[PDB]
């Protein structure tokens, strides 16, 4: 998910 | 300095007062539209 933002 | 160190505390303030970690909780989902909208309006607040 954060991954995903990043 | 002054107006600098002023202005950049009041950037924070909205760090201090830890408001993103709410809408960070109901954007748990998915939405590449309000995340593009969120970070809009963090550079919005910049250009403020």
């Not at chain 2, 002023?6 to 993103?20: D, E, H, P, V, W």
């Not at chain 2, 748990?28 to 995340?35: F, L, N, P, R, S």
């Amino acid at each position: 998910f954060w991954k995903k933002i990043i | 300095l002054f107006a600098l160190r002023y202005n950049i505390l009041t950037l924070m303030r909205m760090l201090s007062l830890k408001s993103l970690k709410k809408q960070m909780k109901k954007v748990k989902k998915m939405t590449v539209k309000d995340m593009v909208t969120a970070f809009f309006s963090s550079y919005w607040s910049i250009f403020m």
